[PDB]
Amino acid sequence: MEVIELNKCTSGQSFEVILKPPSDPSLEEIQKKLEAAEERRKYQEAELLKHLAE
Amino acid sequence: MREIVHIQAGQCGNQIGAKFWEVISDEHGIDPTGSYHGDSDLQLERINVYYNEATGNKYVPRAILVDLEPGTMDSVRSGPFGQIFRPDNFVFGQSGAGNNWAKGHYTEGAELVDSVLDVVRKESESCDCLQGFQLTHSLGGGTGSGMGTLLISKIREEYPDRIMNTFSVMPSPKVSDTVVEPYNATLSVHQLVENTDETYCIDNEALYDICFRTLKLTTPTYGDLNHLVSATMSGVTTCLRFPGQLNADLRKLAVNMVPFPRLHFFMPGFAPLTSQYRALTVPELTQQMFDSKNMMAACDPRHGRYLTVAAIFRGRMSMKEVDEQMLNVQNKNSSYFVEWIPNNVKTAVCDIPPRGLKMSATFIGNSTAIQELFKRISEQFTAMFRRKAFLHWYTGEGMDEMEFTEAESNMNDLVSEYQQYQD
Amino acid sequence: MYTFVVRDENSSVYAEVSRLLLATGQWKRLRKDNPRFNLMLGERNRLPFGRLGHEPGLVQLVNYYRGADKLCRKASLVKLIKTSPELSESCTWFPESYVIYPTNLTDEREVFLAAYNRRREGREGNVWIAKSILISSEASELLDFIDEQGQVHVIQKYLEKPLLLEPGHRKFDIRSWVLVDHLYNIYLYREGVLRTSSEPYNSANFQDKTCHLTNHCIQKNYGRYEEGNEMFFEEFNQYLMDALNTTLENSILLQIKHIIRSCLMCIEPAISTKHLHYQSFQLFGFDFMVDEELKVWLIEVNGAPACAQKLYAELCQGIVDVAISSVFPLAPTSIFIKLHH
Amino acid sequence: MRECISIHVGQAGVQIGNACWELYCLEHGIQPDGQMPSDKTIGGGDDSFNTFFSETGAGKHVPRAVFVDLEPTVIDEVRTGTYRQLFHPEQLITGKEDAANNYARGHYTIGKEIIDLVLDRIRKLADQCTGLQGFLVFHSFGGGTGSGFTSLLMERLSVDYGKKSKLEFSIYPAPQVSTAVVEPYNSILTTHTTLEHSDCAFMVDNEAIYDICRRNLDIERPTYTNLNRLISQIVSSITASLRFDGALNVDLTEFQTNLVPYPRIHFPLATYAPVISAEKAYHEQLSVAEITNACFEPANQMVKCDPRHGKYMACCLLYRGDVVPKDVNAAIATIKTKRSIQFVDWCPTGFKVGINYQPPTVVPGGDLAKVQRAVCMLSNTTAIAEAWARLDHKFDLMYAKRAFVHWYVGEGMEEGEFSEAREDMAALEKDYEEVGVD
Ligand SMILES: Nc1nc2c(ncn2[C@@H]2O[C@H](COP(=O)(O)OP(=O)(O)OP(=O)(O)O)[C@@H](O)[C@H]2O)c(=O)[nH]1
Ligand SMILES: Nc1ncnc2c1ncn2[C@@H]1O[C@H](COP(=O)(O)OP(=O)(O)CP(=O)(O)O)[C@@H](O)[C@H]1O
Ligand SMILES: Nc1nc2c(ncn2[C@@H]2O[C@H](COP(=O)(O)OP(=O)(O)O)[C@@H](O)[C@H]2O)c(=O)[nH]1
Ligand SMILES: CC(=O)N1CCC(NCCc2ccccc2)CC1
Ligand SMILES: [Ca+2]
Ligand SMILES: [Ca+2]
Ligand SMILES: [Ca+2]
Ligand SMILES: [Mg+2]
Ligand SMILES: [Mg+2]
Ligand SMILES: [Mg+2]
């Protein structure tokens, strides 16, 4: 039960009490995922428009 | 500004659509001439969802009336709220469809469809953000069934990413105009399976039994049946027409109601239905809402299981008590709800009750018990088709038996699909 | 109409409890995977406590106390007693025990040998017993047997002077069932059972563990003196009066009630559900030893105990009354003894 | 002085952001028009509140915040609300149609078409920062925008501000105040792609906030306003050290240092007390020990779980009000002897304490009562993994049948990302059990 690093200022204070000691994707890769998903949608909608034209 | 374009096709579609606009127009404070004379701002809050705003603070429904004969739409334009519809939005022919799906879909309907799309295109272009389309129609006739699905397939080509909802009246021999209704209904169901996001199945037999047994009406009429459809159409669209949270728009309702694309056929339910001054408690609204007698598809929910449910309570009530009774129904019948979709029963509250009711409840169910509705149609269909009876009405319009076999096969698959998820 | 689920098909105790529930016409059983349940008769291992108490409008209950394993594990019980100031290392009703990990894996090997050596020099009885069974007086045999295995073991003193029944000169042990409800009332079933050894106790041969281990399976002279080597409190009480001139309540029952209170009241802050989003109850089986001085010792604690065949009805009916209906009431002369605290 | 930019995404993010900035102004004495009579350095300054408020020559204090929603109805409230004058139009961004509770729709379909814009608006606020520390992102797990677009934003922020920290305040889904059935899907999808991009994430379970409002405030049917006023109180406690003079958690980096010894285990549990009803006749003011003891009651945690059955990696006590260090230690020593606080062996058994003398502020007319002293505890327990377990269970129930999966595939997402995200959760749950189980 020890207190350490007691800091005090006009607006408050902080301290630490110890009881016991111890024992990414690039901008390119992102723009690819996005366009891939946009392409799979374009393919799905093209198959629908092809189905409707038939 | 999430607008919806409404379409009503055929005799049944326009007679029910007329009553629908008569009901909500009253709820939103719009008189037969399109002038607003309400007292609450909640009415106008989401008024642009169904109504356009013309010069002079006028509100004109965003509705398109379609038919192949002038008889029915002439009555609408001469009816109560006849003057409210945009005069240009009446599109009709003189030939008729003779209760023939082929005529509505391939011959007579093909001649008139292009001029209907010119009106749809006009209404959509004026929409700041078009949600989608809703269509009221019967499946047993010729125009609403045959041309109705033709409009859906053609509108889909032009607005493929919007939402398509239908209120579809299913035929029953107990309330029959012609023997060919099963043919038309089966041909349409195939279309709806592929082209709509949501279809509210309104079985004329359920409506009949409710009028005869529950409402104690000795001789039900189409007028009496259309009253129940009005009350239900008003209830199921309350989520869209007033300031709310869940199922606020068409795509969001679909996301929470449709777990599998082909299984988008709902059983609507309404409460109360009195044969009338007594107050209805919250427990009573809930027991009646889920009771089969109050359901309008004529499918006993105790025969299947609910994939998802959307409940709506209208009026000034205890939202705390609403949550209690809802949880009570689910917990007291958890064997009729699939256990592999957590929290699949959603409830919404609205403070504006329907005309003449202190409070009410509208029920939207996606139950596998709807499969029995398609079983009736399939049995009635094959009874005539195995003898090729009455096919000449259709083959004489350019169709082929193969097209009938295909529609039949797709509906049987739909049934088998419901069956596997019921287990 | 309350709902419950069954997740332990092998629980004879709750198989009967579930039978009685359905017999009341007010409890409906659901599929074992249905979450809209009021009561859960859960599995033994890996019971998913983290999913309880998160169903709106549902008061959920379960037949196990999360954390109770600290009391129902050979190694965990030893560590709990030694480290809990409530029980302390000087606990008088618990045999001197030690946690010994096999050499193929803290550990208490050296601490165990310090006491063992002290006895070997003090001419005192140095007969120990390891388990997780081998009884031996040489520490070399005990430690060498745990190494041949690959799981944690515990070496505790063997009661060389156990109380022997007559006629027969035979060992025994006592089983008490203890139900702790959602409020943490400690109820002790008025009916215990003594699992006796049908073989005369022989202190000069620990190789034949038939007269030393009183388990109903090992024994099963079976059924000679009493049916199924099982003696109940009525006969055992009359025996203590005829032989020793004392009652079961005075000579033994006071100590058992003390031991049960101490153990449960100690881990109460760790397992209580008084402020939890779900509620817990659990049935316990305490096993005791009695020596020729009428002093009671704590053998172990069982977290999923079975019940004596003759008492399944009465006790199971009791589990429903004070543990299940106390939370979900239905529309005496209690069989339990409340250990107040 | 180092600046902090707040980003509010989706309805839950925006509305909660409205509650916090309302409270921030009431605390720092900033009126709805942006004026601050106490700021004697007009048009500038390097004070503590400047980390959250920019300054114009006219003396207005503008929040360093950006609001993003794919549907314009929730942010239109801000544009015409009480604090409409606080923000300039550049800070409020809105689209036409939302993500419809569809993670794929918010991440791919709609997100791809508005991601470069939001970044350009953030870049505008960054340019006003002379020493930007990082970002605080508010969003829901269940919403299509809060989940889908947030994770896309988090990736871009890591690319455009790789050296800056990022903190999340995430709303965990609760069926009692939710109607979307697919929120388990979105929750786990957003956690997978956002995990490697977040430094410290505070989860708020709506079920916890809901029960606190009914139990402590006597709100039979709480509304989002009730929930958000309470949530912003906890957020104020957590962000107070960045906005006021002090020495504990002085910058966003310190949050990771003090609360996250293991990078993948960066979800601290928050506990707050006391929550007293303003409608209460009058409450007896609780002491340091009673409110500190209350921090170990599950009933005031932001996420229901049982810390008694996990292990602590870090514990941080943040007091506001009449609190002296002497009383804090007197309460801690009282709780160690009663509570079951097991720490991981590789972490020291200890508590970092921060005390701010100004007591909590309460929005006039709100639901909370003025209290003399309040504490918020930030503890890193392995017990919070219970919330992932619950969420994972619901995911598996639906994915086994592929229920609703077609909505995501229809927005261009591949089905594989489901199991990819789920496997990452199975990995997250394995790290938690390696830390707090023997
Ligand atoms: N605490 C709190 N939770 C909210 C709030 N608003 C929504 N939620 C929760 O957030 C979840 C829904 O996500 P939203 O934020 O509404 O969705 P979104 O980010 O706007 O994305 P969209 O799907 O495009 O509308 C539900 O679980 C709600 O309970 C709020 O104001 N406060
Ligand atoms: N310290 C000790 N001294 C003497 N005998 C002991 C002893 N510990 C256990 N025994 C004997 O072993 C039996 C208890 O064994 P234990 O309970 O450890 O095995 P077990 O758990 O498989 C049976 P249960 O769990 O059902 O009681 C008692 O009947 C007793 O005779
Ligand atoms: N509920 C209801 N059903 C109707 C109404 N009119 C017709 N029907 C049903 O619809 C089918 C006839 O379709 P109909 O609308 O006349 O065909 P259409 O004019 O070619 O579109 C039959 O099954 C009738 O039972 C009505 O007003 N209400
Ligand atoms: C999943 C599923 O059932 N689908 C069928 C419904 C489809 N959306 C509606 C298409 C539309 C749009 C405008 C007019 C008419 C039709 C999506 C796929
Ligand atoms: Ca012609
Ligand atoms: Ca300044
Ligand atoms: Ca990073
Ligand atoms: Mg007709
Ligand atoms: Mg045992
Ligand atoms: Mg939204």
Question: How far is residue B363's CA from residue B368's CA, in Å, rounded to a whole number?
Answer: 15
Query: Hey, is the C-beta of A47 within 8 angstroms of any chain B C-beta?
Result: no
Atom number of ligand 4 nearest to Cα B152: 15
B139 and B287 both lie in a single domain: no
A49: distance to nearest CA of chain B, Å? 7
Question: Cα–Cα distances in Å, from B74 out to B6, B9, C126?
Answer: 19, 14, 110
Question: How far is residue C145's CA from residue C132's CA, in Å, rounded to a whole number?
Answer: 12
Question: Cα–Cα distances in Å, from D8 out to B26, D66, D111, D126, D188?
Answer: 40, 6, 15, 16, 20
Query: Hey, is the C-beta of D206 within 8 angstroms of any chain B C-beta?
Result: no
Structure tokens at C128: 């120990």
Contact D109 A23 (CB under 8 A): no
Question: What stretches of D255-372 adopt beta strand conformation (E)?
Answer: 269-273, 312-321, 349-356
Query: Degrees (nearest 5) of the Cα angle D139, D145, D149?
Result: 90
B272 and B158 both lie in a single domain: no
Half-sphere exposure of D398 (CA within 13 A, CB side): 27
Structure tokens at D366: 């709100």
Nearest CA in chain D to A4: D352
Structure tokens at D194: 């956002």
Provide, as residue numbers in chain C, all residues whose Cβ is less than 8 Å from the Cβ of B334. 3, 30, 34, 36
CB neighbours of residue C55 within 10 Å: 21
Task: Note every long-range contact of B31-39, with CB atoms under 8 Å and residues 24 or more positions apart, other chains counting.
Answer: B32/B80, B32/B81, B32/B82, B32/B83, B32/B84, B33/B58, B33/B83, B33/B84, B34/B58, B34/B59, B34/B60, B34/B83, B34/B84, B35/B59
What SS3 state is found at D192? helix
Per-position DSSP letters for D16-57, written without gaps between them: HHHHHHHHHHHHHT--TTS--TT--STT----SGGGTEEE-T
B317 and B382 both lie in a single domain: no
Question: How far is residue B212's CA from residue A12's CA, in Å, rounded to a whole number?
Answer: 77
Question: How far is residue C225's CA from residue D366's CA, in Å, rounded to a whole number?
Answer: 77
Query: Hey, is the C-beta of C53 within 8 angstroms of any chain D C-beta?
Result: yes
Structure tokens at B138: 């019967």
Of B369, B386, B405, at which residue does a domain stop? B369
For residue A8, the cross-strand partners are A13
Structure tokens at B192: 């709806």
Residue type, B29: G
Question: How far is residue D373's CA from residue D321's CA, in Å, rounded to a whole number?
Answer: 4
Cβ of C154 below 6 Å from ligand 2:
no
CA-nearest residue, atom 6 of ligand 1: D12
Contact B335 C1 (CB under 8 A): no
Closest CA to B109 of B121, B90, B95: B95
Nearest CB neighbour to B255, from listed D101, D220, D221:
D101
Structure tokens at C188: 């002790």
Structure tokens at B312: 């709506």
User: What sign has the CA pseudo-torsion D269, D271, D277, D278?
Assistant: negative
B329 and B197 both lie in a single domain: no
Query: Degrees (nearest 5) of the Cα angle C120, C122, C128?
Result: 45
Q: What share of residues in chain D are helix, strand, coil (percent, to 5)?
A: 45, 20, 35
Structure tokens at B167: 């209120």
Structure tokens at C53: 């108490």
Pocket of ligand 4 (CB under 6 A): B 133, 152, 155-156, 159-160, 162-164, 195-197, 261, 264
Domain boundaries, chain C: 2-68, 69-70+163-339
B305 and B392 both lie in a single domain: no
The answer to whether C131 and C154 are in contact (CB under 8 A) is yes
Strands across the sheet with C128-131, in order? C97-100, C153-157, C128-131, C134-136
What SS3 state is found at D177? helix
Q: How far is the CA of C191 from the centre of ligand 2 (A)?
A: 20
Question: Cα–Cα distances in Å, from A16 out to A4, D231, D353?
Answer: 5, 27, 6
Helices (H), strands (E): how many in chain A? 1, 2
Closest CA to D285 of D377, D373, D359, D376: D373
Structure tokens at D423: 């496997």
Dihedral angle over CA of C133, C137, C141, C146, nearest 10? 40
DSSP one-letter code for D105: I
Question: Cα–Cα distances in Å, from B356 out to B16, C279, D152?
Answer: 20, 46, 50
Question: How far is residue B67's CA from residue B104's CA, in Å, rounded to a whole number?
Answer: 9
Q: What is the residue whose two structure tokens read 């409707």?
A: A52
Q: What is the residue whose two structure tokens read 């007091």?
A: D319
CB neighbours of residue D359 within 10 Å: 16
Question: How far is residue C4's CA from residue D413's CA, in Å, rounded to a whole number?
Answer: 40
Question: How far is residue C3's CA from residue C26's CA, in Å, rounded to a whole number?
Answer: 9
CB neighbours of residue B246 within 10 Å: 18
Structure tokens at D28: 């720092």
Nearest CB neighbour to C56, from listed D176, D308, D385:
D176
A48: distance to nearest CA of chain B, Å? 8
Question: How far is residue C147's CA from residue C101's CA, in Å, rounded to a whole number?
Answer: 8
C28: distance to nearest CA of chain B, Å? 9
Closest CA to C200 of C212, C191, C190, C187: C212
What SS3 state is found at B274? coil
Domain C2-68 in this protein, CATH class: alpha beta
Contacts of D362 (CB under 8 A, 6+ apart): D278, D368, D369, D370
- Chain C interface, best mutation among B321, B329, B334, B343, by max C CB count within 10 A: B334
Half-sphere exposure of C109 (CA within 13 A, CB side): 12
Question: How far is residue B177's CA from residue B204's CA, in Å, rounded to a whole number?
Answer: 12
Residue ranges making up the domain that contains B146: 1-259
- Residue-level length of chain D: 438
Phi, psi (degrees; rounded to nearest 5) at B12: -55, -45
Q: Beta strand C282-290 with C172-180: parallel, antiparallel or unpaired?
A: antiparallel
The answer to whether A24 and D151 are in contact (CB under 8 A) is no
Provide, as residue numbers in chain D, all residues whose Cβ is less than 8 Å from the Cβ of C49. 306, 309
Closest CA to C157 of C201, C118, C193: C118
Q: In whole angstroms, what separates CA B276 from the centre of its chain? A: 26
Peptide bond before residue D179 is cis, with ω within 30 degrees of 0:
no
The answer to whether C191 and C232 are in contact (CB under 8 A) is yes
Query: Hey, is the C-beta of D385 within 8 angstroms of any chain B C-beta?
Result: no
Q: What is the residue whose two structure tokens read 């890769």?
A: A29
Binding residues of B for GTP: 11, 69, 138, 142-144, 204, 226
Residue type, D347: C
Cβ of C126 below 6 Å from ligand 2:
no
- Chain A interface, best mutation among B117, B149, B155, B157, by max A CB count within 10 A: B157
For residue D94, the cross-strand partners are D69
B200 and B143 both lie in a single domain: yes
Dihedral angle over CA of B54, B56, B61, B66, nearest 10? -70
What SS3 state is found at D189? helix
Structure tokens at C282: 């659990």
Phi, psi (degrees; rounded to nearest 5) at B268: -80, 150
Q: For chain B, what is the domain count?
A: 3
Per-position DSSP letters for B166-205, written without gaps between them: EEEEEP-GGG-S-TTHHHHHHHHHHHHHHH-SEEEEEEHH
Query: Hey, is the C-beta of C102 within 8 angstroms of any chain D C-beta?
Result: no
Cβ of D145 below 6 Å from ligand 1:
yes
For residue B168, the cross-strand partners are B137, B201
Provide, as residue numbers in chain B, all residues whose Cβ is less than 8 Å from the Cβ of D407. 255
Binding residues of D for Mg(2+): 71
B281 and B381 both lie in a single domain: no
For residue D374, the cross-strand partners are D320
The answer to whether B205 and B175 are in contact (CB under 8 A) is yes
Q: What is the residue whose two structure tokens read 């063997």?
A: C158
Of B225, B259, B293, at which residue does a domain stop? B259
Q: Beta strand D92-94 with D53-55: parallel, antiparallel or unpaired?
A: unpaired
Q: How far is the CA of D134 from the centre of ligand 8 (A)?
A: 68
C233: distance to nearest CA of chain B, Å? 44
Cβ of C291 below 6 Å from ligand 2:
no
Residue type, D309: H
Query: Hey, is the C-beta of B153 within 8 angstroms of any chain A C-beta?
Result: yes
Question: How far is residue D32's CA from residue D39's CA, in Å, rounded to a whole number?
Answer: 15
Cβ of D224 below 6 Å from ligand 1:
yes
C182: distance to nearest CA of chain B, Å? 23
Question: How far is residue D219's CA from residue D56's CA, in Å, rounded to a whole number?
Answer: 41
For chain B, the straight-line distance linking the first and the last C-alpha, in angstroms and rounded, comes to 42
Structure tokens at D369: 């009562």
B213 and B326 both lie in a single domain: no
What SS3 state is found at C298? strand
Q: In whole angstroms, what separates CA A49 from the centre of its chain? A: 37
**What residues of D act catalytically?**
254
What SS3 state is found at C62? strand
Query: Hey, is the C-beta of B334 within 8 angstroms of any chain C C-beta?
Result: yes
CB neighbours of residue D331 within 10 Å: 19
B82 and B115 both lie in a single domain: yes
Peptide bond before residue B182 is cis, with ω within 30 degrees of 0:
no
**Residue B5: in which H helix or E strand, if any?**
strand B2-9
Question: How far is residue C313's CA from residue C320's CA, in Å, rounded to a whole number?
Answer: 11
B245 and B133 both lie in a single domain: yes
Q: In whole angstroms, what separates CA D396 from the centre of its chain? A: 27
What SS3 state is found at D193? helix
Please state the CATH superfamily assignment of the domain spanning residues C69-70+163-339 in this structure. ATP-grasp fold, B domain (3.30.470.20)
Q: Which residues surround ligand 7, an ion (CB under 5 A)?
A: D 158
Question: How far is residue C206's CA from residue C117's CA, in Å, rounded to a whole number?
Answer: 20
Q: What is the residue whose two structure tokens read 């193969």?
A: B402
Query: Hey, is the C-beta of A16 within 8 angstroms of any chain D C-beta?
Result: yes
Which subunits have 3 or more CB–CB pairs within 8 Å of chain D? A, B, C
Question: How far is residue D232's CA from residue C53's CA, in Å, rounded to a whole number?
Answer: 26
Structure tokens at B110: 């093909």
Query: Hey, is the C-beta of B327 within 8 angstroms of any chain C C-beta?
Result: yes
Question: How far is residue B200's CA from residue B256's CA, in Å, rounded to a whole number?
Answer: 15
Q: What is the residue whose two structure tokens read 């509906």?
A: B411
For residue D205, the cross-strand partners are D172
For residue D132, the cross-strand partners are none
Q: How far is the CA of B103 from the centre of ligand 5 (A)?
A: 11
Residue type, D216: N
Question: Cα–Cα distances in Å, from B269 out to A7, B358, D87?
Answer: 67, 18, 47
Cβ of D178 below 6 Å from ligand 1:
yes
Contact B157 A52 (CB under 8 A): yes
Structure tokens at B423: 């287990």
DSSP one-letter code for C320: I
From D149, D172, D177, D228, the mutation candidate for ligand 1 (largest count of ligand atoms within 8 A of CB) is D177
Provide, as residue numbers in chain D, all residues whose Cβ is less than 8 Å from the Cβ of B2. 97
CA-nearest residue, atom 13 of ligand 2: C213
- Chain C interface, best mutation among D306, D337, D395, by max C CB count within 10 A: D306
Of B208, B229, B259, at which residue does a domain stop? B259
B315 and B172 both lie in a single domain: no
